[model samples]
Target: SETVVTEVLGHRVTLPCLYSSWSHNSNSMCWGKDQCPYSGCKEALIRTDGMRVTSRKSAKYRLQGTIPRGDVSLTILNPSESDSGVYCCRIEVPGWFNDVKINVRLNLQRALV
Candidate 1:
């Protein structure tokens, strides 16, 4: 588990989830914290539709394109202070069961007025 401290001070922040075996449609792809296979995190981000965004945080957050080349990244819009923490980008495949966690950490910061 790699820990990274990122400052969020813009319209949004894009969390990268690079993988080797990435398919067009995954059984499940999510961003959360604590334990393997997800659960126990204060925040969560899941794909609702055509990479739609719906989570404990902003609804504007969603997955970025270019999955073919292996990019299951998440883009958060108008992030809040509460959005900071350790986030895992997970993906579930057929034979492997459950999900595979990807390294993508975040530390939200408010922009100066």
Candidate 2:
């Protein structure tokens, strides 16, 4: 439910999330900037429909995980100081209050000048 991930600035960082129990033709999930809300996410960055990435806010965000296998992790390329914050990954399961949520706190360290 909660975790911390530290990475240097300008480096690639991955926030892990996996729902191995999920096995459906169509999978819906989202990666948001901040913490997740009650139903959906706050400031959703990227979304996935089935095995393809449907929508993304920026080019720096990527969903490289296998959607079919329920790996909906978020990867940030060239992460900067502004990216240091909380990130949430939400998996919309087909049921009431059955969404799988993962929160990751990303801490980016700047290199010495």
Best by lDDT: 2
Which segments of candidate 2 are over 4 A away from where they belong? 37-43, 111-113
Give the TM-scores of the predictions, in the order they appear.
Answer: 0.65, 0.86
Residue pairs in collision within model 2: none
Instruction: Point out where model 1 deviates above 4 Å.
Output: 1-5, 25-28, 33-44, 48-58, 110-113
What RMSD, rounded to one decimal, does every model reach?
Answer: 4.5, 2.6
What would the per-residue lDDT of candidate 1 be over residues 1-113, giving only the tens digit for each residue?
Answer: 57665665555778777766666564445566543234322346554222333344446566765655566677777766666666677665657444567766677666433
Looking at candidate 2, what is the lDDT of residue 3? Answer: 88
lDDT of the candidates, in the order given:
0.59, 0.81
